[PDB]
Design an enzyme around this catalytic site. Structure first.
Site, PDB file in Angstrom:
ATOM      1  N   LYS B  10       0.869  -1.189   0.000  1.00 10.34           N
ATOM      2  CA  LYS B  10       0.000   0.000   0.000  1.00 10.34           C
ATOM      3  C   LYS B  10       0.897   1.227   0.000  1.00 10.34           C
ATOM      4  CE  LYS B  10      -4.520   0.294   0.390  1.00 10.34           C
ATOM      5  NZ  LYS B  10      -5.329  -0.477  -0.641  1.00 10.34           N
ATOM      6  N   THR B  57      -3.850  -5.530   0.424  1.00 12.45           N
ATOM      7  CA  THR B  57      -3.206  -4.228   0.635  1.00 12.45           C
ATOM      8  C   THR B  57      -4.067  -3.401   1.599  1.00 12.45           C
ATOM      9  OG1 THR B  57      -4.212  -3.069  -1.258  1.00 12.45           O
ATOM     10  CG2 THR B  57      -2.178  -4.324  -1.679  1.00 12.45           C
ATOM     11  N   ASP B  58      -5.384  -3.592   1.541  1.00 13.86           N
ATOM     12  CA  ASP B  58      -6.305  -2.967   2.519  1.00 13.86           C
ATOM     13  C   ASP B  58      -5.960  -3.356   3.955  1.00 13.86           C
ATOM     14  OD1 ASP B  58      -8.942  -1.366   2.685  1.00 13.86           O
ATOM     15  OD2 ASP B  58      -9.233  -3.045   4.074  1.00 13.86           O
ATOM     16  N   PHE B 159      33.356  28.906 -10.195  1.00 14.89           N
ATOM     17  CA  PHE B 159      33.494  27.762 -11.065  1.00 14.89           C
ATOM     18  C   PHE B 159      34.420  28.110 -12.233  1.00 14.89           C
ATOM     19  CE2 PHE B 159      32.019  24.380 -14.095  1.00 14.89           C
ATOM     20  CZ  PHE B 159      32.510  23.293 -13.342  1.00 14.89           C
ATOM     21  N   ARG B 176      29.492  33.724  -8.477  1.00 17.18           N
ATOM     22  CA  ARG B 176      28.177  33.380  -9.033  1.00 17.18           C
ATOM     23  C   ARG B 176      27.216  33.076  -7.898  1.00 17.18           C
ATOM     24  NH1 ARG B 176      28.711  27.006 -11.185  1.00 17.18           N
ATOM     25  NH2 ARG B 176      29.100  26.240  -9.039  1.00 17.18           N
ATOM     26  N   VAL B 227      30.005  22.551  -6.958  1.00 21.27           N
ATOM     27  CA  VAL B 227      29.047  21.867  -6.141  1.00 21.27           C
ATOM     28  C   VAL B 227      29.705  20.582  -5.616  1.00 21.27           C
ATOM     29  CG1 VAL B 227      26.856  20.682  -6.132  1.00 21.27           C
ATOM     30  CG2 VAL B 227      27.074  22.811  -7.335  1.00 21.27           C
ATOM     31  N   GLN B 228      30.467  19.916  -6.485  1.00 20.42           N
ATOM     32  CA  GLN B 228      31.177  18.669  -6.149  1.00 20.42           C
ATOM     33  C   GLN B 228      32.036  18.852  -4.878  1.00 20.42           C
ATOM     34  OE1 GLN B 228      30.648  19.896  -9.227  1.00 20.42           O
ATOM     35  NE2 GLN B 228      30.773  18.299 -10.826  1.00 20.42           N
ATOM     36  N   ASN B 254      21.865  21.925  -9.566  1.00 20.33           N
ATOM     37  CA  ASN B 254      22.449  23.246  -9.618  1.00 20.33           C
ATOM     38  C   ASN B 254      21.395  24.106 -10.310  1.00 20.33           C
ATOM     39  OD1 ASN B 254      24.145  25.447  -9.734  1.00 20.33           O
ATOM     40  ND2 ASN B 254      25.728  24.470 -10.992  1.00 20.33           N
ATOM     41  N   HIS B 256      20.125  27.140 -11.860  1.00 25.23           N
ATOM     42  CA  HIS B 256      20.896  28.253 -12.425  1.00 25.23           C
ATOM     43  C   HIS B 256      20.167  29.587 -12.382  1.00 25.23           C
ATOM     44  CE1 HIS B 256      23.601  25.136 -13.758  1.00 25.23           C
ATOM     45  NE2 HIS B 256      22.654  24.575 -14.489  1.00 25.23           N
TER      46      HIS B 256
HETATM   47  O1  LIG Z   1      29.430  23.464  -9.629  1.00 27.19           O
HETATM   48  C1  LIG Z   1      29.355  23.174 -10.848  1.00 27.19           C
HETATM   49  N1  LIG Z   1      29.679  21.905 -11.190  1.00 27.19           N
HETATM   50  C2  LIG Z   1      29.672  21.459 -12.455  1.00 27.19           C
HETATM   51  O2  LIG Z   1      29.942  20.284 -12.761  1.00 27.19           O
HETATM   52  C3  LIG Z   1      29.266  22.406 -13.504  1.00 27.19           C
HETATM   53  N2  LIG Z   1      29.152  22.300 -14.870  1.00 27.19           N
HETATM   54  N3  LIG Z   1      28.738  23.598 -15.255  1.00 27.19           N
HETATM   55  N4  LIG Z   1      28.592  24.499 -14.180  1.00 27.19           N
HETATM   56  C4  LIG Z   1      28.940  23.735 -13.080  1.00 27.19           C
HETATM   57  N5  LIG Z   1      28.968  24.114 -11.777  1.00 27.19           N
HETATM   58  O1  LIG Z   2      -5.868  -6.834  -7.139  1.00 30.23           O
HETATM   59  C1  LIG Z   2      -5.691  -6.661  -5.908  1.00 30.23           C
HETATM   60  N1  LIG Z   2      -4.524  -7.116  -5.393  1.00 30.23           N
HETATM   61  C2  LIG Z   2      -4.209  -7.026  -4.093  1.00 30.23           C
HETATM   62  O2  LIG Z   2      -3.123  -7.418  -3.630  1.00 30.23           O
HETATM   63  C3  LIG Z   2      -5.184  -6.378  -3.204  1.00 30.23           C
HETATM   64  N2  LIG Z   2      -5.197  -6.125  -1.852  1.00 30.23           N
HETATM   65  N3  LIG Z   2      -6.450  -5.496  -1.659  1.00 30.23           N
HETATM   66  N4  LIG Z   2      -7.210  -5.350  -2.839  1.00 30.23           N
HETATM   67  C4  LIG Z   2      -6.402  -5.923  -3.806  1.00 30.23           C
HETATM   68  N5  LIG Z   2      -6.650  -6.047  -5.134  1.00 30.23           N
END
Ligand SMILES: O=c1[nH]c(=O)c2nn[nH]c2[nH]1
Ligand SMILES: O=c1[nH]c(=O)c2nn[nH]c2[nH]1
Ligand SMILES: O=c1[nH]c(=O)c2nn[nH]c2[nH]1
Ligand SMILES: O=c1[nH]c(=O)c2nn[nH]c2[nH]1
Ligand code: NA
Ligand code: NA
Ligand code: NA
Ligand code: NA
Lengths: 295, 295, 295, 295
Positions: B10, B57-58, B159, B176, B227-228, B254, B256
């Site tokens: 679920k 799932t209910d 950079f 920047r 950033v790296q 990043n 921009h």
């Molecule tokens: O911080 C940055 N890392 C990157 O790899 C990059 N490539 N363009 N500008 C950038 N700025």
């Molecule tokens: O098709 C269904 N599969 C399930 O596993 C399920 N559990 N509740 N209702 C359901 N319906």
């Protein structure tokens, strides 16, 4: 057929501006998304393929960057007013500019308990927005807002005494979870032009701060009878604290959290006073709106 | 044909839990989204329409709520380990459980400078996550992470000195903007079972906090060569501070921000030393990854 | 500490290409989003700030456009193989390229029952994808997929005979709605290099078409005993029709539609045989996976 | 302070309905998302915590399912009108209902060239929508729309003769790509009530089909002078074909695809007549709107 209304322009223009204080070394960043739509004597572009009346949307984009380069971008109410006034003054045939600005949060980082000169964090997707309509001969209308403010209280919310008829299954309750995303808008009295907007500049940030504070405090402290009753309290307070506001509008979803009955499993008690685990509901949601003005 | 691998369960199970301190009145909320996928002797459900091997799932959904009702949900490393162990112990033919938990922020509100007993704000979409794989006979493998931590620095990133050939147009730079969304994962040494996970419980929140602090401090303080180079510094420090971690992995876009040449307009100066207004780029983005372990 | 794994490159590179048939005037468009990540002798960029080993991600972006200009972009299996081979052949110290391509639908419009020479519609967000890993000395590994194929059948799905214990509340059923978003991947036998990929070019589109057809037909015609049993039938058929495929993997959400009991209102009958109105559930959802290979 | 405007209700109500033809065995499915907001004499819920005036949003949700059980859900114009009329007739103090419906595509599958009795595919995220405002004493106002119709033409679009001044950098062009997401709305003449809406039932699907056909044909066939000129042509035709429509509104983004100059690399020719590879731009975008009515 006839053109009854028309507007055109550029949407989703992302803009960043940095301010560098040479004395202190401190840098401050602003980031916004801007939309500008123009109206005026442009019907012939639609009806006769007359492009001579079109200020190209690409040019609108250029103008936004140029205006940001030459003017302060804060408060956004001022920037939007400058930007809109530009278009109606520059172009004879353009008679209205509609400027929408969304401001993104870049909050200064605190590192080892001191504010860092040039590093920022996005603390939440809450936005501060403005809508500015600049109309030739009719001044400047400004609606300011906050949105995307997501809150939850785990108790001190109630909902009882509502209408009950043959469509009603909801049980009355004296203790529930209340959670919402706040969208609050305050509409300023009409301004005669840029000079008047400039004169009120300090009120813009102050009123935003007040709106935010009143929202948070009222939500946290009201023993809420309903979303309706709590939101009205917020709106009332904002209007009381700033006389240049004419109306306040709130739009609030009611984001439901449902109890889960587990009694089928070994008599496990998880409802009412014993409720501990709940199921947040993605949809549907209540949606409650109100606009409050002065008597 | 033959079933080579199979898992089912679920996804997207939203869970909220509240804790109420009766003495102090303080309430604390936790909200998560949970996914549980099971493996074991279930091939016949696919090949022969033999549903007898299927824990519905209910039912998995029910089990998540029941487990949350009867156990602490924090730290998520512990909750995930309890949840996964349940499935492999309860069902003879289920031999592995894979539990993924995303924790959502509900941060206590401060109102008038005091922490509020029962009101919370979502401050950012940053998440704390766990992936817990519980495998019968092979113990408990836990990968913890933070994600959605969005930061920007406006200077002190460089950079230059990269490879230049006939595919290269990028200019070297000594100043920047650097902005990223941090995704950082630390992988714990294998645990023999629940008793051992329980014994290390205090280390989980502490190590999350350390990872977050090291990330923010290094980003803010490193005069970054790339950033790296900056991400390696972060990973090195985390490994130094917690001996029960085997590897640290970072994945960093990043994001921009481009200079905008405005010299075409009235000789306006907006590049290099004079750059003030930039255009944030939604795409493309750089993507840089590294996994650092012990010598 | 030591670098245990590292890869870096450019993500989210949007590319459009048009082909113009001069004889007929017909134009054909292709739009993709491309990601290229490189590995090799690049550890020193992380550990020593040695950028000399870095082919800049900006250059990777340029290379994608140049490669698209000089080569066919279809089928994506071929384009990805050309793109990846480029990097490992051009740069001595780069030993692996990982190329991911998402293909967006632009389907030719039919206007007045004739195909239009140059107008296209996006019919659904279904994607055709490839993942191509080009590793120096180890050939070319290609995984092809379709995703975002959203289907629903309103009857001829069952689910009974599953395990029932104290965690089970789900009722057995002989008639339910079944709806899913199909994610299907077929993994090709390893190819020795570009010449071999080129030799099998016609099989790529044919096998995509077969996978799609088998998926749709089996879903529509199987009186389904479970999602597990139906998906296995699909995988079995694909493997039977293309000998160059080694494995087929399906990942299928079970998107639930719940009956709504309305008997509380005027005895209205809306369950079992009388069920007409249902509530689609956004979450949680079942998630069922399987990988099928050859005996 | 005073309540100036208020409305409240339930949003995001997902609804599915199936119709089963007993004679032929053919099944037909409808799926929608519905929002209902009410207005009337409800001010006291905001101002005095008087919940007695509130029809709970949970009850609104129940009413949507009950109404869908007892009435046809197609065309959506009719369903929305029934739903809105219900609220204003049932509750004395409710004087307006605002109903928004989004219809999701479930298109019958063709398997081996024959239409399948009970299997469906979501072909695109295009929607058909209605907005229905039912106001006591003022009849029924209906705005119908299509949205999310994404199209592209690779030639036969031009843009030249626009205003050029010191803000302009855009080059005139006689051959460009044009791509948009169509949002088209047609507003019906006011209807006196349900009986009148019922009388025009066959016109709703017919007019939707006409709007869609005119949009697609005009886009594909117009040698477009601008987005403005092409959209006007569409609107003019729709108004000509259905006299019960008062206005047509289009809102169209201009989704830009930029040429990529590759001449820096080995003199490679990729601009103007030689342009083959383009860079789709995610943002900004032009946004062009117009409302066309009758002379
Ligand atoms: O911080 C940055 N890392 C990157 O790899 C990059 N490539 N363009 N500008 C950038 N700025
Ligand atoms: O098709 C269904 N599969 C399930 O596993 C399920 N559990 N509740 N209702 C359901 N319906
Ligand atoms: O069709 C267009 N309309 C416009 O208003 C415009 N402005 N720039 N490009 C444009 N294209
Ligand atoms: O605060 C609330 N307001 C409402 O109108 C409502 N309707 N159901 N639950 C509700 N809660
Ligand atoms: Na003007
Ligand atoms: Na077991
Ligand atoms: Na190489
Ligand atoms: Na009424």
């Amino acid at each position: 057929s006839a053109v009854k209304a028309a507007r055109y322009g550029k949407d989703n223009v992302r803009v960043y501006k940095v301010h560098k204080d040479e004395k202190t070394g401190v840098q401050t960043v602003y980031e916004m998304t801007v939309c500008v739509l123009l109206e005026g004597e442009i019907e012939t572009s639609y009806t006769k393929a007359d492009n001579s009346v079109i200020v190209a949307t690409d040019s609108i984009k250029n103008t936004i960057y140029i205006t940001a380069k030459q003017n302060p971008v804060t408060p956004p109410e001022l920037f939007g007013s400058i930007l809109g006034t530009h278009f109606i003054e520059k172009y004879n045939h353009i008679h209205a500019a509609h400027v929408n600005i969304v401001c993104h949060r870049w909050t200064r980082m605190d590192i080892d308990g001191k504010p860092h000169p040039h590093s920022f964090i996005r603390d939440s997707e809450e936005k501060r927005n403005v809508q500015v309509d600049v109309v030739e001969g009719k001044g400047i209308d400004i609606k300011s807002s906050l949105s995307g403010l997501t809150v939850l209280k785990s108790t001190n919310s109630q909902f009882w005494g509502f209408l009950r008829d043959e469509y009603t299954t909801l049980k009355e309750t004296w203790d529930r979870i209340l959670s919402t995303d706040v969208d609050a808008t305050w509409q300023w009295k009409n301004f005669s032009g840029l000079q008047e907007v400039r004169s009120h500049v300090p009120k813009f940030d102050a009123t935003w701060a007040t709106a935010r504070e009143v929202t948070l405090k009222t939500f946290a402290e009201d023993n809420s009878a309903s979303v309706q009753a709590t939101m009205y309290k917020m709106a009332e307070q904002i209007l009381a604290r700033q006389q240049l506001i004419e109306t306040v509008e709130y739009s609030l979803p009611n984001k439901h959290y449902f109890e889960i009955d587990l009694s089928w499993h070994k008599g496990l008690q998880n409802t009412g006073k014993n409720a501990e685990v709940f199921a947040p509901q993605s949809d549907p949601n209540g949606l409650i709106k109100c606009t409050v003005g002065r008597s």
